[PDB]
Amino acid sequence: MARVAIPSVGKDLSSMVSDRFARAEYFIIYDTESGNVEVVENTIADAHGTGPKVVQSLVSKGVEYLIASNVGRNAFETLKAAGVKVYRFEGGTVQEAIDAFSEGRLEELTTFTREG
Secondary structure, three states, X not given: OOEEEEEEOOOOOOOEEOOOHHHOOEXXXXXXXXXXXXXXXXXXXXXXXXXXXXXXXXXXXXXXEEEOOOOOOOOHHHHHOOOOEXXXXXXXXXXXXXXXXXXXXXXXXXXXXXOO
């Protein structure tokens, strides 16, 4: 059992999932013990900075997982620093990231490319 986070852009369970962990706007933390959810509101819409902050918060709510197709930048190392299993997602609202993951139709995203 764990906490998966999901990069949303709003505070309902059929809001759109963002194509970017560290450029999401909300993080939906599904507690796989009592079907409970928390909506974090994390106003990360740029790159650079010092410290995770995004990661620091989610991590400090035990999050050992994530459903995120890609990242902004400056977070992926601090994810795995807290054993955070980052999945891919591709095209869905917050529930789809779960329904997809839970019934094994998502990918483990344990590296990715960036020509930037």
